[PDB]
Amino acid sequence: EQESVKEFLAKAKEEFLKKWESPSQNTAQLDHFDRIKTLGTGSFGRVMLVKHKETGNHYAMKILDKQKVVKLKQIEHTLNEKRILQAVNFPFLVKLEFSFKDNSNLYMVMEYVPGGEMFSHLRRIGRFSEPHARFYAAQIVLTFEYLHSLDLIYRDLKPENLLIDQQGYIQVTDFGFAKRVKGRTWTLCGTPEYLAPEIILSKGYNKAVDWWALGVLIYEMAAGYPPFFADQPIQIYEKIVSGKVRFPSHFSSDLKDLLRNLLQVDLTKRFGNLKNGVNDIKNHKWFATTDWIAIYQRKVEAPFIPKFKGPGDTSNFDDYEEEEIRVSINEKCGKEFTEF
Ligand SMILES: N[C@H]1CO[C@H]2[C@@H]1OC[C@H]2OC(=O)Nc1cccc(F)c1
Ligand SMILES: N[C@H]1CO[C@H]2[C@@H]1OC[C@H]2OC(=O)Nc1cccc(F)c1
Structure with a gap:
């Protein structure tokens, strides 16, 4: 070689x-963003197009429900995913820009890729x-x-x-x-x-x-x-x-x-x-x-x-029922996700 x-x-x-x-941790929070549209779903999470309120930049926010991750035996896999994404760097890999968690959910905020x-x-x-x-x-x-x-x-x-x-x-x-x-x-x-x-x-x-x-x-x-x-x-x-x-x-x-x-x-x-x-x-x-x-x-x-028409155009993604992003007033599964 x-x-x-x-x-x-x-x-x-x-x-x-x-x-x-x-690893990096806790680099934004949910009310820094406005929600625009659900880009598709899954058994324990969803991906949503969002806009950052200060900068106006668009991102793809992946949201995972902590209680469903535990129930479907995906704890180690979710921790692998975020630890690997925050450490890699290559021309053909999506970039992770922020990550954080709250009482109910884990969040991975990536650059938005408008071609679908x-x-x-x-x-x-x-x-x-x-x-x-x-x-x-x-x-x-x-x-x-x-x-x-x-x-x-x-x-x-x-x-x-x-x-x-x-x-x-x-x-x-x-x-x-x-x-x-x-x-x-x-x-x-x-x-x-x-x-x-x-x-x-x-x-x-x-x-x-x-x-x-x-x-x-x-x-x-x-x-x-x-x-x-x-x-x-x-x-x-x-x-x-x-x-x-x-x-x-x-x-x-x-x-x-x-x-x-x-x-x-x-x-x-x-x-x-x-x-x-x-x-x-x-x-x-x-x-x-x-x-x-x-x-x-x-x-x-x-x-x-x-x-596509611009950085916020969703025409190359398809249509899903829009559901709440709800956050409990009590902390769930805190132990299991300490390192996230
Ligand atoms: N057909 C399935 C699988 O992909 C679709 C649909 O459900 C979820 C959707 O995922 C996304 O849009 N993810 C995504 C991730 C990073 C950047 C970005 F711009 C989009
Ligand atoms: N979609 C991602 C990746 O490309 C964009 C974006 O993050 C920022 C940019 O970083 C890079 O160009 N990375 C890179 C460049 C040269 C060599 C190498 F090993 C990695």
């Missing part, structure tokens, strides 16, 4: 560990051409090189978690399942269509599960649908562990070869997890036209720019 890549990753790890060992989900644009167009898919995939390869060098596993890659910014580049969001791992880890988590065989089989697993999920993502971007699907998760799991996959005839031979090596059921033979690491991917024939430095420096003109 070139010495400039080695020195870049060594400095990146030094800066991450300084923030990891001394990659998934929305994929379904509007049908499928991405191979040059368009390759522009997005190169950004994910560089982001995993960075996260894996910090001993982090991401564990939720899918098109709904990749937002498109005002220059047409990716911002990765949702670190709810991310974790710092030396060696192996064991938690069953993720989305069914994207799970590697070793997660389904309850084995001890490692960063190779993120390279499997990159194979699922590139297939989905280039075909318009993922490689393994069915009405019941147990049927999806049976197709994943089987060791077979069918490719559309319009795929190039170079694309098929790359996908057979990422969607490799034996984790000890999978690209990204061999002696040469990420360079088996960067040097594959499917990426021969990619300028890795130009992508990192954001100097390549993007294939597509989202249509």
